[PDB]
Write a protein that binds this ligand. Structure first.
Ligand SMILES: *[C@@H]1O[C@H](CO)[C@@H](O[C@@H]2O[C@H](CO)[C@@H](O)[C@H](O)[C@H]2NC(C)=O)[C@H](O)[C@H]1NC(C)=O
Ligand SMILES: *[C@@H]1O[C@H](CO)[C@@H](O)[C@H](O)[C@H]1NC(C)=O
Ligand SMILES: *[C@@H]1O[C@H](CO)[C@@H](O)[C@H](O)[C@H]1NC(C)=O
Length: 378
């Protein structure tokens, strides 16, 4: 019958396995265990016992990170009424008892990152209306049911990256400020009204929906299945959007005409054969990544290119490129294309290395190096 004491409370060398019977925490007199901040060092609790919070009833911040927890006793959080921040990440927890969060009304932060959760009990967060930050990344979740966040009307940060999710409707959480659903199996993305940073990279998304949102500033959608970009018109505040590794076949200026401050646009590794940002260039654009596509003719985009600081054209089939004497490029990639030699000679009157970041090493029979890049004379 071990008795673990603090030494505002750090437990040392607590070792509870599944077999272990009841153990003791703090002083027998509950009133002496008035510590508000609880953490463990060099400890393992394969099952989280009720004895901990039965004895410490004034805990506000409970850190159970990396305690090798596999199971939570059903009534572990019976006397947890004062807890505001609960950290239970980096364990091996397989399920949450249905009413585990029934008596934590003041909960604002909950971390369950890196565990073994495969589903959420109905009503798990129905009694935690103050919840503002939640992480359940690195679990095995397949579905977030639509009633999950009905009560969490102040939820601001939601991290669900690296699960197996085929459904989670973020439109049902209008309070969202930061949301991360990267590395899942989503096919549809509804973007809530006020989210400022949203990462839905590494999914299977082919449709983007939602109301005009003037707050969205960072949108990560790389590694999905997008075939259009019209929906971009709904996000006039974007500063960065990553559309790389999708199925886009053309980029036109139309979807970007409402962009007030877009600076970084990544579109590498798509299937682009057409590019028109000259009808109406994006005035604020600084970085444009068009590498690894199937572009052939892009010279008409000069007015857009002239204003950039970084332009990546490598790995296409581009034949010509024109820049004004006063262009602002600081980083340019050009290798692995299909250059006309005359175009390269003209180009290098206004730009050179190391601004030009790359080069071709060898050329095919009909080609030769012109300023370090393969080209054919015509
Ligand atoms: C969404 O969550 C993922 C995973 O937590 C974040 O991935 C990190 O991204 C940075 C670069 O921005 C990498 O250097 C880190 O290694 C990544 N962390 C991990 C654990 O993989 C990602 O940043 C999040 N998205 C946003 C926009 O915040
Ligand atoms: C989406 O893209 C991935 C990777 O290219 C591909 O394997 C998958 O077939 C695509 N998904 C659908 C449903 O088109
Ligand atoms: C230029 O951009 C490329 C992106 O392909 C990057 O790898 C490189 O570090 C940049 N070079 C400089 C000098 O910043």
């Amino acid at each position: 019958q071990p008795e673990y004491k603090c030494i505002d409370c750090v437990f040392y060398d607590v070792h509870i396995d599944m077999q272990t019977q009841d153990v003791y925490f703090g002083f027998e007199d509950i009133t002496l265990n008035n510590q508000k901040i609880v953490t463990f060092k060099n400890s393992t609790m394969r099952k989280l016992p009720a004895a901990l919070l039965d004895s410490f009833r004034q805990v506000e911040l409970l850190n159970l990170n990396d305690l090798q927890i596999e199971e939570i006793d059903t009534y572990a959080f019976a006397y947890a009424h004062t807890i505001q921040k609960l950290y239970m990440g980096f364990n091996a927890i397989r399920y949450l008892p249905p009413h585990v969060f029934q008596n934590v009304p003041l909960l604002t932060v909950l971390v369950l990152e890196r565990n073994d959760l495969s589903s959420l009990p109905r009503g798990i967060f129905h009694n935690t209306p103050k919840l503002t930050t939640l992480s359940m990344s690195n679990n095995n979740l397949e579905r977030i049911e639509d009633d999950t966040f009905q009560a969490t009307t102040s939820l601001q940060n939601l991290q669900l990256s690296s699960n197996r999710l085929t459904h989670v409707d973020l439109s049902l959480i209008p309070s969202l400020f930061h949301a991360n659903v990267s590395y899942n199996l989503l096919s549809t993305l509804a973007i809530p009204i006020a989210v400022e940073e949203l990462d839905a990279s590494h999914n299977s998304i082919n449709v983007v929906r939602g109301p005009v949102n003037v707050e969205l500033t960072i949108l990560k959608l790389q590694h999905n299945n997008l075939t259009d970009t019209a929906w971009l018109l709904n996000y006039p505040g974007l500063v960065e959007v990553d559309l790389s590794y999708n199925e886009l076949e053309k980029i036109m200026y139309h979807p970007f005409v409402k962009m007030q401050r877009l600076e970084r646009l990544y579109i590498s590794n798509n299937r682009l054969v057409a590019l028109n940002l000259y009808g109406q260039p994006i005035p604020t654009l600084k970085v444009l990544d068009l590498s690894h596509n199937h572009l052939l003719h892009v010279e008409r985009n000069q007015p857009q290119f002239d204003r950039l600081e970084n332009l990546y054209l490598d790995h296409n089939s581009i034949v010509t490129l024109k820049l004004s004497t006063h262009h602002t490029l600081k980083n340019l990639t050009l290798s692995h294309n299909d250059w006309d030699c005359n175009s390269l000679r003209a180009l290098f009157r206004n730009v050179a290395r190391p601004a030009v970041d790359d080069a071709d090493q060898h050329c095919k029979i009909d080609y030769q190096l012109e300023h370090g890049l393969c080209c054919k004379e015509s």
